Amino acid sequence: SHMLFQNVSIAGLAHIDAPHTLTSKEINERLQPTYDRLGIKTDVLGDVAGIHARRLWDQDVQASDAATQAARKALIDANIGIEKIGLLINTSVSRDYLAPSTASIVSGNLGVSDHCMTFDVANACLAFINGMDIAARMLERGEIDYALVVDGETANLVYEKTLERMTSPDVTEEEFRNELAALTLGCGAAAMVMARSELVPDAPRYKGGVTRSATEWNKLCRGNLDRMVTDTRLLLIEGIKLAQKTFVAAKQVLGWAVEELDQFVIHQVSRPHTAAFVKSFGIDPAKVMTIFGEHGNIGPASVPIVLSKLKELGRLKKGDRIALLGIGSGLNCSMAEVVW
Amino acid sequence: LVPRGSHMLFQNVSIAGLAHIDAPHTLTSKEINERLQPTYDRLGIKTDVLGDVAGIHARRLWDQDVQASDAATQAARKALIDANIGIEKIGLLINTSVSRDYLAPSTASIVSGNLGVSDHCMTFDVANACLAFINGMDIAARMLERGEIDYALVVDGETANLVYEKTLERMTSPDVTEEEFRNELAALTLGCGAAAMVMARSELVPDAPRYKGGVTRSATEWNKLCRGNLDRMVTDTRLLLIEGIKLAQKTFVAAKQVLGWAVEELDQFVIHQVSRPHTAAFVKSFGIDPAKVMTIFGEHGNIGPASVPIVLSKLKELGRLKKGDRIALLGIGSGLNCSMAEVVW
């Protein structure tokens, strides 16, 4: 009985790389006194997490500015003007205010029309995929012809504050390990234009997918603009268990088998998360592009940034079956298919 | 006579349950005015700008330890009892409040954890200032219409304690300027409260009210008019009034085309409220009969996106709604956005 979306396309896609590099060698030089004054012995960022660098924005780029840049790029990629957009959804973790929606700020910056509906979705690192599904459901019903899904992430504050706390005279060491995951984050932005397939006949098709949850674990990863507290070991383990659930579901509603899929575009928390993941499922590592090593974790923008890089590098061919996979704080796990 | 299309109104979507929670502690505008009086005197303010101009006599507050997720959970347990269903039957839970626990995880996932949703249950937050509950209803409705779930919960907890405490500190500073005072004043018309609604496929709840959906228009060039964080809200009330009314005029024209509305055919208007003069101007602009406009602003303030469902709940519990009544759900929210939707009781 389950029907996938059949008239929803991706008309354009774009990403923005933030311009300032902060290396994990430079972070380590700053933290070395504190590493020594408790003899931390391993380089956890570079050697364990597998993050060698991340990007940061210019001072006072807001989430709305970053999303706006990506959106302009995505409109050019779709070859459409802003007057065609009927829905603008912002899916970032970073937000200018509690009200109004960051989506209304981006939409104001772009000059959308008075028919354009706008709102934000929040759902930690899965929100872009939620935003895509929300938009597809409007597209499918005929409410709009084109939608923009946007996401701008700003981590400059979290770096500045996290690094002060960690180089304090007072600073202790249960906190160091609870805080250190904030130094895996990065800045970046992405946007996607989605459309009714009759308007864009050659474009990739979005089929939808499945979601499962384990909300019993909503305590494991709490973040505000200035701080992120995480139980990294436990979110690893309970993530993988939830993904296995979500895979079986994806067997039945999507027809999935690993090996018939051409690419896996996965949210990337760390080299160890990623390796446990692909080993659990026997996925070919070559079908799994990663940017974490140079960009860190860009929250909900990671998925579409990786899809955009796949596209720009020429790796995606007509007919490829693309799996979009995220495990997000919640815990929530969504898995969706695009047919290129 | 002539075969016509649905206008993309929702089919077979119903409201199975509804509930509201009033926050327990009353904060009168008289006690506020007593705290602000030295500032009033230094600024030459001689009228009661809260009680007489804005038209708010009291609002409600939680204990300082109540978070958004906790208020939303309390309302959700009551709405599940009103729908006579267990949490295992919920396939979608959407949080719509402006207030929130954290940037991540979503407040939806904390509420869902507290309630013990199943692992099939999809959860996420929507943020759209005071229209978000309507957006969440629409999102749920598309899923129910399509048959993907049977039941959805839309929940909303608003916590205004912090804004009150910090605003009143700033507004009683010996150095606050007139302009900063006026910019922050609308924070003192906010209230705390919570509401929750269970939506369902109509085949499951054949006597329940139907939700039709409706329309939306925007004026996002006006996105700077009202900005807020958990401790601070700055608002240009004069242009929110002027540009809000103009936006609503446009949205009404679309609502006549799509929902067939004429104002005299509606039995009740559930309108988001920012202030007694804003409401009086809206009702007078559109020719609405004020006996069909329930107000809680006088004793509760503006509870943000929970305002519309609170009002609907309280209409339900007062016995003011009967089978077949056509209920208009209306608001202008910061953005600017305007939504107008219909429920058939």
Swiss-Prot record, chain A:
Involved in olefin biosynthesis. Catalyzes a non-decarboxylative head-to-head Claisen condensation of two acyl-CoA molecules, generating an (R)-2-alkyl-3-oxoalkanoate. Is active with fatty acyl-CoA substrates that ranged from C(8) to C(16) in length, and is the most active with palmitoyl-CoA and myristoyl-CoA. Gene3D superfamilies: 3.40.47.10. Its EC number is 2.3.3.20. Its main location: cytoplasm. One of its GO terms (biological process) is fatty acid biosynthetic process. One of its GO terms (molecular function) is 3-oxoacyl-[acyl-carrier-protein] synthase activity. Belongs to the thiolase-like superfamily. OleA family. The active site is at A99, C125. It is an enzyme of class 2 (transferase). It is found in: Cytoplasm. It catalyses: a 1,2-saturated acyl-CoA + an acyl-CoA + H2O = an (R)-2-alkyl-3-oxoalkanoate + 2 CoA + H(+). This is Acyl-CoA:acyl-CoA alkyltransferase. Inhibited by cerulenin. The record marks H267 as: Important for activity. Coiled coil: none annotated. Contains three extended channels that together form a T-shaped, three-channel nexus. Contains an active site base originating from the second monomer of the dimer. The gene is oleA. It comes from Xanthomonas campestris pv. campestris (strain ATCC 33913 / DSM 3586 / NCPPB 528 / LMG 568 / P 25). Mn(2+) binds at H20, D58. Homodimer. Weakly associates with the OleBCD complex. Keywords: Acyltransferase, Cytoplasm, Manganese, Metal-binding, Transferase. It holds the Pfam family ACP_syn_III. InterPro entries: ACP_syn_III_C, ACP_syn_III_N, Thiolase-like.
